[PDB]
Amino acid sequence: MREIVHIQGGQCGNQIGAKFWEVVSDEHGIDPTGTYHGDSDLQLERINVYFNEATGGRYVPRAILMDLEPGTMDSVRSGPYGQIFRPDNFVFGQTGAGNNWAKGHYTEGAELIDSVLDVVRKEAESCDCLQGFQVCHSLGGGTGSGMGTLLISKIREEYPDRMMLTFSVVPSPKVSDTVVEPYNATLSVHQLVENADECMVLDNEALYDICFRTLKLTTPTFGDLNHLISAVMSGITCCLRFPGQLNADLRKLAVNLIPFPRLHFFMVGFTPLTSRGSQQYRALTVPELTQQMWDAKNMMCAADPRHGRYLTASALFRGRMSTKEVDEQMLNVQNKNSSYFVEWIPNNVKSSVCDIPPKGLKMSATFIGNSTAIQEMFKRVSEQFTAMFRRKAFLHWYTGEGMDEMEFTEAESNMNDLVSEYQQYQ
Amino acid sequence: MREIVHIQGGQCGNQIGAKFWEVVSDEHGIDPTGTYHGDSDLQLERINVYFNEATGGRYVPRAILMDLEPGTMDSVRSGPYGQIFRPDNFVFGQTGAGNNWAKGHYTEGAELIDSVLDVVRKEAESCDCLQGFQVCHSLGGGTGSGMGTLLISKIREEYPDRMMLTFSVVPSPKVSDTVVEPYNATLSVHQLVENADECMVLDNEALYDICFRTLKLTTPTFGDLNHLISAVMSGITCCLRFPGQLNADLRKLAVNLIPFPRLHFFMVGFTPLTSRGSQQYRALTVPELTQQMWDAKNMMCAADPRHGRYLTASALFRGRMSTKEVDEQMLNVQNKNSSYFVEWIPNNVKSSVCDIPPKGLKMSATFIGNSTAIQEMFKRVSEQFTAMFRRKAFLHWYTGEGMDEMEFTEAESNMNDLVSEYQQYQ
Amino acid sequence: ITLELKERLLRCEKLQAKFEIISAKHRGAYYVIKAAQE
Amino acid sequence: EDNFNLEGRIMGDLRAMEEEAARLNSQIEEGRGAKRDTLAEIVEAERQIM
Amino acid sequence: LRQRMIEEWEAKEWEEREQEILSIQDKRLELLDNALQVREEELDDE
Numbered sequence: 006m007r008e009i010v011h012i013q014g015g016q017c018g019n020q021i022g023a024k025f026w027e028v029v030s031d032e033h034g035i036d037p038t039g040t041y042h043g044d045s046d047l048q049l050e051r052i053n054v055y056f057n058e059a060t061g062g063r064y065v066p067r068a069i070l071m072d073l074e075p076g077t078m079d080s081v082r083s084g085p086y087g088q089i090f091r092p093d094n095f096v097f098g099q100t101g102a103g104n105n106w107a108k109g110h111y112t113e114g115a116e117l118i119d120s121v122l123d124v125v126r127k128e129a130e131s132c133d134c135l136q137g138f139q140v141c142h143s144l145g146g147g148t149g150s151g152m153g154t155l156l157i158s159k160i161r162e163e164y165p166d167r168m169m170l171t172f173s174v175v176p177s178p179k180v181s182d183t184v185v186e187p188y189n190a191t192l193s194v195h196q197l198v199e200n201a202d203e204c205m206v207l208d209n210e211a212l213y214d215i216c217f218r219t220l221k222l223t224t225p226t227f228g229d230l231n232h233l234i235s236a237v238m239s240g241i242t243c244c245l246r247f248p249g250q251l252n253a254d255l256r257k258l259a260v261n262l263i264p265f266p267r268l269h270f271f272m273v274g275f276t277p278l279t280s281r282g283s284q285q286y287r288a289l290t291v292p293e294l295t296q297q298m299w300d301a302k303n304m305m306c307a308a309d310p311r312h313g314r315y316l317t318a319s320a321l322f323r324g325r326m327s328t329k330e331v332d333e334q335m336l337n338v339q340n341k342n343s344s345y346f347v348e349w350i351p352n353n354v355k356s357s358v359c360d361i362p363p364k365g366l367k368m369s370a371t372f373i374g375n376s377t378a379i380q381e382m383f384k385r386v387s388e389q390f391t392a393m394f395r396r397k398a399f400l401h402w403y404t405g406e407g408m409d410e411m412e413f414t415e416a417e418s419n420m421n422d423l424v425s426e427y428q429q430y431q
Numbered sequence: 432m433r434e435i436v437h438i439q440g441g442q443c444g445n446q447i448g449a450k451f452w453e454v455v456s457d458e459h460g461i462d463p464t465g466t467y468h469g470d471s472d473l474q475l476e477r478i479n480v481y482f483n484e485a486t487g488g489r490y491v492p493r494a495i496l497m498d499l500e501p502g503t504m505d506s507v508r509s510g511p512y513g514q515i516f517r518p519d520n521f522v523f524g525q526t527g528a529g530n531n532w533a534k535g536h537y538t539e540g541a542e543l544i545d546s547v548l549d550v551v552r553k554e555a556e557s558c559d560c561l562q563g564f565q566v567c568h569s570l571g572g573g574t575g576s577g578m579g580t581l582l583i584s585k586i587r588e589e590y591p592d593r594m595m596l597t598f599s600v601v602p603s604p605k606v607s608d609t610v611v612e613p614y615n616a617t618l619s620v621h622q623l624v625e626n627a628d629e630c631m632v633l634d635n636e637a638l639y640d641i642c643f644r645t646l647k648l649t650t651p652t653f654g655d656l657n658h659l660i661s662a663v664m665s666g667i668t669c670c671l672r673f674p675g676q677l678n679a680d681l682r683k684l685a686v687n688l689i690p691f692p693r694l695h696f697f698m699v700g701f702t703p704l705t706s707r708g709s710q711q712y713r714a715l716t717v718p719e720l721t722q723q724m725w726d727a728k729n730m731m732c733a734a735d736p737r738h739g740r741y742l743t744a745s746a747l748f749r750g751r752m753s754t755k756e757v758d759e760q761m762l763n764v765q766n767k768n769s770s771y772f773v774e775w776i777p778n779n780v781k782s783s784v785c786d787i788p789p790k791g792l793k794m795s796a797t798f799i800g801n802s803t804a805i806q807e808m809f810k811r812v813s814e815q816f817t818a819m820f821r822r823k824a825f826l827h828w829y830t831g832e833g834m835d836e837m838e839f840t841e842a843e844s845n846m847n848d849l850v851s852e853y854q855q856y857q
Numbered sequence: 858i859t860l861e862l863k864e865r866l867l868r869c870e871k872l873q874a875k876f877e878i879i880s881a882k883h884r885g886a887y888y889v890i891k892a893a894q895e
Numbered sequence: 896e897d898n899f900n901l902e903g904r905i906m907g908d909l910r911a912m913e914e915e916a917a918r919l920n921s922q923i924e925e926g927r928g929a930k931r932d933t934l935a936e937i938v939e940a941e942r943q944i945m
Numbered sequence: 946l947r948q949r950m951i952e953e954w955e956a957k958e959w960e961e962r963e964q965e966i967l968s969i970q971d972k973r974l975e976l977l978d979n980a981l982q983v984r985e986e987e988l989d990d991e
């Protein structure tokens with residue numbers, strides 16, 4: 006009954022969402038055509054959080070899709086579980102992003118977001134009780150970084166109370182697949198810090214390292230990375246869709262994980278991640294899940310958490326579980342290393358349980374940590390921005406489209422003060 | 432409750448351990464697939480000392496293979512019973528020590544030891560109560576002597592209250608297969624006397640003589656030598672897995688045997704070993720088992736115990752038996768051969784009984800002697816080491832790779848005082 | 858050097874256990890006062 | 896052209912040698928620190944035994 | 946009790962013995978520390 010609305014923007018956002026709806030639809034048991042052909046009757050009870058019955062059981066997912074070129078909507082419709090998306094939810098442009106934050110957020114924003122707010126508001130009226138918004142987009146692009154950010158501004162201006170999960174991927178040195186990442190990263194993070202509520206930050210090098218080390222894959226690709234991100238995005242909302250020994254709503258996650266309003270850039274990881282070669286050797290037990298969680302090699306972001314201090318953390322668990330073993334593990338891990346957690350907070354770790362594990366498993370978890378070692382993520386982009394902007398590199402694409410260098414300087418200043426705040430709380 | 436983790440170093444160690452698991456898995460009743468299909472419950476009742484349950488009746492051994500080549504591991508996997516192993520334990524490089532102690536202890540050892548300690552830590556943490564480790568290796572190679580020595584030293588710097596059963600296949604001259612055996616053997620025993628706590632001496636010369644004389648085999652390949660060594664290794668440690676009238680575990684054996692803080696080099700036998708023609712024309716009485724057990728052409732060592740006194744001895748019988756018969760047998764042996772026993776230790780011999788014999792053999796026994804004849808093997812390797820080292824033959828392969836000359840001389844001195852302590856106490 | 862340190866730590870633990878067991882055996886010093894008073 | 900390429904490759908090899916030298920220096924400094932703190936720990940162990 | 950105030954001074958003299966033990970151990974431990982420094986210095990030189 007607590008509604009969730011999903012917003013997809015950018016090519017990466019569209020692909021990630023087309024995989025996330027894949028996982029959610031298959032686990033609630035709706036077949037590709039759009040009807041309901043599940044097995045158990047416990048999944049039927051909460052399909053309203055993500056789906057609307059139109060007429061005759063043709064469930065339509067409650068999602069908004071946006072971009073600037075039809076070359077992504079074509080792929081979205083082509084891919085599996087493509088027919089489910091309501092055809093009214095394909096707001097697309099005609100020009101293209103161009104990787105310029107100016108085109109993303111100022112020029113095309115005016116003629117696209119004004120048109121997509123109609124769809125999002127109609128969806129909000131169609132659903133009854135909005136719990137919040139979940140938006141999956143990009144920070145290294147033109148549509149997700151700029152147009153998605155301006156849409157975030159407009160949505161927060163409209164609904165102040167609702168929470169916002171911002172599933173955002175960020176650029177990286179080793180996997181820098183384009184040459185103006187710093188600009189479109191700073192100009193997006195400046196609004197993201199002020200305007201969002203839970204920043205789920207991801208990347209590509211972390212996902213590749215996961216698919217190489219933990220999953221032992223041979224040729225990992227965007228399909229696999231998006232599958233992992235989908236698994237996390239389903240685990241984060243498992244609680245609203247299924248009952249359990251101790252429920253955990255989105256506002257509860259925010260309250261237990263945020264000690265200061267602008268300190269809300271979390272880092273997420275999944276568990277268990279085991280190879281198909283050695284599926285039948287490991288033991289799906291709480292100590293093993295917690296050992297796999299609390300380590301750098303599983304975090305889905307380029308952060309070395311042991312080079313920082315976990316301010317807070319949260320652990321969702323799924324499966325017929327004993328909260329006694331769960332919280333003794335969460336306390337033993339906390340007391341082994343008191344240095345890596347902050348001094349002035351007792352019980353740095355929140356735990357929650359649900360009684361239905363995901364399809365294809367029997368026992369799972371999801372770790373969301375508010376650490377202070379995530380400052381170096383933004384530090385890399387900040388130093389790249391300084392080096393590039395000191396010589397006005399590529400600056401004309403921005404300063405010829407209604408933008409002033411004051412914007413660049415202030416965005417850099419905001420990133421600097423945020424990273425200073427993280428560094429201070431250590 | 433007690434736990435043993437088994438580590439295999441080098442090609443010799445890997446083959447011996449593979450055959451050992453082939454034997455012990457059968458003695459516990461589990462097939463190569465990993466699913467129990469035996470008969471009784473006395474097997475399953477204490478298999479937790481070796482195996483871990485994975486997922487519904489899939490038992491995985493607690494062993495770690497390790498070397499510097501992929502070919503040996505490929506052979507081990509291709510062989511029978513190799514499936515049970517967890518693929519995560521398979522740690523290896525690609526270059527190869529090449530019978531070089533400097534490679535096996537300083538370059539490749541350094542570059543693999545940090546990785547291997549991760550997996551040994553995983554196994555030693557997944558357990559509940561450790562009593563000691565097992566290591567299988569040679570003393571005449573690079574991946575086995577130097578790397579095994581580095582591994583056991585790294586273990587001692589971490590678990591300073593535990594034993595290791597280091598089964599060392601000593602390089603025999605008449606069965607030598609590489610040009611520089613002593614340059615490895617001396618430099619390995621240097622630290623074997625310092626760190627390892629129960630070094631079990633074995634030699635291909637004595638194994639081949641046993642096979643030729645007693646077994647009357649025609650074409651003894653390494654299979655049967657590994658079979659004998661595995662039978663000994665599985666028999667030494669049944670006091671844990673099986674309940675006996677007089678139970679004696681590893682610490683009891685160590686404290687009973689080792690009189691002085693550095694005389695841990697055991698010479699080992701096993702009964703009954705028969706040809707399949709004379710197994711129909713013999714009686715397996717307890718006196719007969721004891722006589723074969725003390726038969727000097729049955730100990731797995733090239734040093735005939737007639738060339739010295741016995742510091743102490745221990746016997747481990749298997750099968751329902753008579754404890755008084757055991758004790759009177761050993762008393763008769765000691766009284767008849769009183770000239771071979773140390774005068775300042777009354778009742779130099781220890782006896783233990785387990786109510787389960789190795790399957791097929793309705794009765795069996797094992798012998799662990801601490802006789803002072805062990806000095807023969809060490810003088811017989813020291814002669815070769817001095818003979819080579821007088822003119823620095825084959826020495827540049829180590830000096831250029833990082834070892835000064837003084838280390839070899841210090842190893843000489845340590846070997847000399849080790850071989851001199853036995854002479855002193857004889 | 859780490860080997861020596863670990864050996865010394867084990868010796869310290871042994872002496873700890875010895876002291877605690879001697880305490881448990883004896884008591885199970887506050888007895889002399891009442892002994893003399895009686 | 897060959898001399899230009901040669902000079903470039905020589906300069907690269909140089910910076911490689913200082914890279915590995917810096918790695919070794921850092922490791923040795925770590926080891927010296929570990930040795931001295933281990934001596935401190937052994938002194939504390941003696942005090943505890945006393 | 947009044948007699949206990951004598952017993953508590955017995956305890957005080959026992960604490961004085963404890964201080965004497967502390968001083969003896971301090972002297973011996975300082976000598977041992979110097980010996981350890983000497984051995985380490987010789988090792989480093991060699």
Ligand SMILES: Nc1nc2c(ncn2[C@@H]2O[C@H](COP(=O)(O)OP(=O)(O)O)[C@@H](O)[C@H]2O)c(=O)[nH]1
Pocket residue numbers: 014015016017018020021072073102103104143145146147148149174182183208209212227228230231
């Ligand atoms: N992990 C991951 N990253 C992606 C995927 N697709 C695209 N990306 C990256 O995310 C960024 C998304 O920005 P972009 O595609 O240019 O946005 P748009 O072209 O304006 O719609 C790109 O620069 C890609 O490098 C994906 O499926 N998985």
Ligand SMILES: Nc1nc2c(ncn2[C@@H]2O[C@H](COP(=O)(O)OP(=O)(O)O)[C@@H](O)[C@H]2O)c(=O)[nH]1
Pocket residue numbers: 441442443444446447528529530535569571572573574575576600602606607608609635653656657
């Ligand atoms: N029992 C047994 N011994 C072996 C086998 N193969 C080699 N050896 C012995 O092991 C010694 C060689 O040690 P090796 O495993 O090569 O050490 P490495 O050179 O470091 O790899 C030789 O002296 C052989 O006598 C085997 O299959 N079984």
